[PDB]
Design a protein around this nucleic acid. Sequence first.
RNA 1: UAGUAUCUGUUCUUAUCAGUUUAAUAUCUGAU
RNA 2: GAUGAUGUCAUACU
Lengths: 325, 21, 222, 97, 81, 67, 47, 68, 181, 289
Amino acid sequence: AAFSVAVCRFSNTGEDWYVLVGVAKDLILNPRSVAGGFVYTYKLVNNGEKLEFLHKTPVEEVPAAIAPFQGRVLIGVGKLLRVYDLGKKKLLRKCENKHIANYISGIQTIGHRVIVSDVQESFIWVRYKRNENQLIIFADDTYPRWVTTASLLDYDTVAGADKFGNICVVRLPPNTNDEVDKALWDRGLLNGASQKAEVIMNYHVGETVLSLQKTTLIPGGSESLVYTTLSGGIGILVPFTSHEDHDFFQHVEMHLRSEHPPLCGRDHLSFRSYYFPVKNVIDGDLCEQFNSMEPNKQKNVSEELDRTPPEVSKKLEDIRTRYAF
Amino acid sequence: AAAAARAARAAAWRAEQAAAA
Amino acid sequence: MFLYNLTLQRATGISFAIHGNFSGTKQQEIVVSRGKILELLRPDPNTGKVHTLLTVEVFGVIRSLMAFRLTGGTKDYIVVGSDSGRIVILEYQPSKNMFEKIHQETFGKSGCRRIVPGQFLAVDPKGRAVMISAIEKQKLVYILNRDAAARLTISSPLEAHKANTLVYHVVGVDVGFENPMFACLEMDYEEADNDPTGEAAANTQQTLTFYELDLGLNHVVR
Amino acid sequence: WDGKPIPYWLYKLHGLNINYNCEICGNYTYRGPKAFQRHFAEWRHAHGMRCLGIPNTAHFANVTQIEDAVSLWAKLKLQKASERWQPDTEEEYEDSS
Amino acid sequence: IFCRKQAGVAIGRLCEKCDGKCVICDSYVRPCTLVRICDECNYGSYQGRCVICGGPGVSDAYYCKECTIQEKDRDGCPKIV
Amino acid sequence: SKYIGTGHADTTKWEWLVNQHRDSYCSYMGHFDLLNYFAIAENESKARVRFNLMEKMLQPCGPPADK
Amino acid sequence: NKDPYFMKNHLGSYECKLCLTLHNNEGSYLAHTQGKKHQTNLARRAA
Amino acid sequence: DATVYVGGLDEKVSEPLLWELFLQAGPVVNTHMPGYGFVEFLSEEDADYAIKIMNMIKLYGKPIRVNK
Amino acid sequence: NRFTVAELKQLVARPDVVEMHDVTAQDPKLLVHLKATRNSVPVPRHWCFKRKYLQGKRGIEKPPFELPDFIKRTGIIDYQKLHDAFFKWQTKPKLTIHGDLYYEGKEFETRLKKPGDLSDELRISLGMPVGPNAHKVPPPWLIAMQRYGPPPSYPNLKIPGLNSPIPESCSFGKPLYGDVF
Amino acid sequence: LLPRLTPILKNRHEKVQENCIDLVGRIADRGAEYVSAREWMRICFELLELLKAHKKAIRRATVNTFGYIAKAIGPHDVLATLLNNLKVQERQNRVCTTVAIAIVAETCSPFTVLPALMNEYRVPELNVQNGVLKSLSFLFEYIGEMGKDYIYAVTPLLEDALMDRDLVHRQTASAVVQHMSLGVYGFGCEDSLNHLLNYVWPNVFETSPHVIQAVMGALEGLRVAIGPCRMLQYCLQGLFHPARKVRDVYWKIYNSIYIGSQDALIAHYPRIYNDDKNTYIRYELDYIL
RNA sequence: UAGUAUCUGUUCUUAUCAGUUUAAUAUCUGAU
RNA sequence: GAUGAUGUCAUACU
Ligand SMILES: *C[C@]1(O)C[C@@](C)(OC)O[C@H](/C=C/C(C)=C/C[C@@H]2O[C@H](C)[C@H](NC(=O)/C=C\[C@H](C)OC(C)=O)C[C@@H]2C)[C@H]1O
Ligand SMILES: [Zn+2]
Ligand SMILES: [Zn+2]
Ligand SMILES: [Zn+2]
Ligand SMILES: [Zn+2]
Ligand SMILES: [Zn+2]
């Protein structure tokens, strides 16, 4: 059963693109009892048009996350984070860390930092040094999140999803010493690393997100975080470029929470604060119901904003058109 | 005392409210 | 860092689907639940196509969906059981192309809880009464009638509760013009909770339960 | 009981009627539970752990027996050597294609 | 001290002494959601009476904004017995 | 106290986790996308998944312990 | 008084640092001074 | 001994002052003011280096006799 | 039926969090497993005390109240100054992580505490003037840090005379995504 | 016109009271130019007592009119009078004064009230500090969402009060924390409330009923504002603590969290491993596509 | 009015086990 | 460095 796939180059090998496929062997889901694991390697011959079976490296757990890393590859074998290098007949385990809590489901990489997603715990930051071959965990986040997938925004900020239908965005605080290095005397803050990652965004979509990407759908616009959901929906998250636009859309969302309640009687604020509270987002699914609301209610909402309902609709369309549609 | 400067404080508050608006 | 959420394409999977005269005309329409989005669709009898008349983001998990028609009426209302803890009766207005909250009865806390109802929903085929029900312990019956102005009146909820009981599926019974009867599949897990041998789980058989509701006597009898 | 005799309610309140024996401290007897948990970071238990070749971390608090202390040290050193990544990497142990 | 039965269609009321008060937390700040009470507490001679004292009701009883935020409006009939 | 799933100072591990598992199963059957996820993992219909979770509601953690 | 043990805290009461005690007024502190605790604490501080 | 006892330091020298004085040789994990003082560092070699370094530090005429 | 604390430390995989009383619970294995859960902040210590968690904080006098510096800069008649204090100089105070509770000696503990340079009052108490000199502004402990090499606990700090030049020692030694503007 | 209206405020009939208060309020709203500050202070002094009326219409009119006067005139003098009243009353109308301070904060800007209010807090008479704390509690409950820009500003005082020796301070500070957390719910103040949660939590073993009641109310407000996951994280160690008292307290808190947040806790329960007899792993949540 | 808090006073063999209970003491019940 | 428990005290706040 294939569960992970990646394409990468290597330092010991030339410009060949290697396809590494992680496969669980005879995995029974309920109850969980895996009989081992394999990582197939293919050389991707005939210019990206054919796979040739080169070798198959057996591993003990499910290699659930494969990611290229500085000319080598990172494989998450259960709770083990292994820096592998490509060998002749097998894959050579060059480094290993085993302070991951339960089970690795995703590995991200930007610069030297490696962001690892646990099946139940949050993102774990690993500082890898090319010297001494060490995977040093230096940060984590203090929430149990059943993370489906993750994404990278810059060197310090990581977005991610949940198995329950949430999207969180966490960020390392400034002036964290990334050059950390006995283990018996030294202890973390709470059963983890000595440094913790603060959450700067949390938002319940209501439908489980399995893919996030920081892209730009239309040319000439600006970058935005696109998510796709298991119920068939595609949404986006748009950063606010000014304080006044954020204040205006905050007031619009506050007015549409009260004067336009949701149809099922659910509180919109409590729906967006389902598992974790809403933070630093404005739900434009409710704000785009301003145009479908009654016109007397439209001017009744818009009179506190000191704007005409055409002007509110113009700002609502401008935040949708100045970013991706 | 404060009673002599009460009108000045009220005028300063009105000026601040005019400048804030 | 402050963000703004948008939906480029709404959810397209269908959890529940019911049919009826929601527009009040002779043609039949489909109400589908896309999870947190309720949609009204019109299957065209001539070209055979499907037109999505209305999409409304309800901002909550629609755990059940069933339509009922009153006796002699020509319009179908939508009974929505959600994670809000409230039972919501809606009517489609074709003039304004929106759903009007005809009734919103609050009975429990919000969320997909084990005993707050909303998961299971049943109607009487004559439209006299509906029964919302949870997985466990808790069934509520709302008797529905009309005033002289042809509106909808919902009664106070009649408790048909039974502790330590799992509900598999509830549905109404077409008894005719007699007392409205609701059919449940039930499991009695109390004997298997206190049996460490595990033999009780191997012998806990299901029960088909007929709850009769006497409208004049205004109570629910097993 | 320091200098003048302490009051008997002070004797019963501190717990000095209950005595705990530590084999690592040379079968030392400590009166009162608060002093008993106080001695584990003190110099006597540190020297007793030095005589046993045990670094006396917080894992060995509330440990009195010698055999229990060395069994805990063996298990802790085993799981610490397992958790630490010793340089046991493989570098082409099957030199063929 | 609370009835806590399953509320129905009956609307809770307040007397002239407690007009505007929240029946759960006693706060006078920001009423939010209309109070519903059980049918037994509104049956017969009890209709329209104050949900705190049982005296004559002159206004509709409300849960405060803080109580509805904490979903303290979903706990049952708040008539004090 | 009358709400099923709450506890007290004498709550046993078995009862607490049985409550957790039953709450979780009801939550899966409520949250459409959780059940969707579970129905994609195995190759079973949603109705079959609902049936399996309902059969698991009787004894989700197995028989209890003595004393 | 002029003793260093008597002080006025941040809470309006009076506190004796020698005995680690709180007193509502001056009379309670002077009754505490004649008590066994203050005499024994002064005898401990006498050495 | 990972904690070094510094004798010869009077009570006029503050515990944050002692922590800052021993902070240059290494990060003081813990401090205690008993007359004398105690400073526990992260590593024993760091404590030995601090004891060898600050022994000649006659702060206001008071040497910091730091011993393991 | 109850096993010893050493036996409980042997059976569980986390013997660090086992205390003396943890064997007396109804389920000790579940207790130590829940104490081994990651982000669970410790239970307050005064469950085992007998002094109601703050009745011992009596003799240590404290300042009555400290003010934040932006409000204190207003001299607390111009309300625009107060608007600037609450909206242009309102710095965030030093908060805490969720795993850091409070106890009796937390206020008087000074773990919050810059290697290679002591304070001005610390240098005055050490008989050292404050300045950019390399003859007296380094401490006398830095003389051994030149003679015996740099300390291993501060590898990024360059000692003057050992790892830093004498005239160069003036103190005796990615863009964010989604931000506004 | 207005000095003629001044003696009519002491009339006992509710209709005259309501109408005259509304008239004075509209005068203060759009025509306060032609009236000196001293007459408005006299009106405020007469108006303060009418905040505790039984009829909600007069209280609402009184709130509106006091707000209009506070908006019209400067904050400083009326605030000084109110703080003076706060210190010299120690009686039932102190809460009246408290309501008036909150009205000033909601109608005018709160940065005109918090500096002077907190500088008066440094006096060591204690009863004045309890008054400041009660004023802050009602102020935050009354202004609601507007308090989101003032959490940091009052965080040090709350740190001081939550660790003070006096237990009345702890109870009122917990009330401030509850009203704060419920007022800023969903506006990103999680870290400041987490910090204040670390000072609110150790008081869960307090025996006084009004205090442990205020602590549980603060915990419920914090469950709403920070989320049930953090509260559950604080809860899990003592749920099976050896001490029965600890188990009673922590199971009470768990019951409150569970009743308020039953469906959310599914995502927040810790991983409990299987044993030799029972299955405790929720395997479905361990599925990875 | 009757509730809480703070001072003063008292606070129970440096003689041994078992049982109830307690997180452990303490308390209570029997034997030496 | 471990200050608890009780009443005839006496003194303060609700
Ligand atoms: C049901 C009752 O409990 C019965 C009874 C006899 O109880 C003793 O009387 C209660 C009434 C109590 C009243 C009216 C107390 C007066 C209070 O005054 C303080 C100052 C508070 N005032 C406000 O909060 C005022 C205005 C607020 C901001 O705005 C509005 C619109 O309310 C609270 C009390 C009113 C009765 O409840
Ligand atoms: Zn010992
Ligand atoms: Zn009732
Ligand atoms: Zn009443
Ligand atoms: Zn309320
Ligand atoms: Zn004294």
